[PDB]
Structure 1
Amino acid sequence: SVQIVYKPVDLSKVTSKCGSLGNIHHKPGGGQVEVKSEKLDFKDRVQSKIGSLDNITHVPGGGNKKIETHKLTFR
Structure 2
Amino acid sequence: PGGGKVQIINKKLDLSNVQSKCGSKDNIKHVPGGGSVQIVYKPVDLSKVTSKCGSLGNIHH
Q: Structure 2-normalised TM-score?
A: 0.34
Structure number, greater radius of gyration: 1
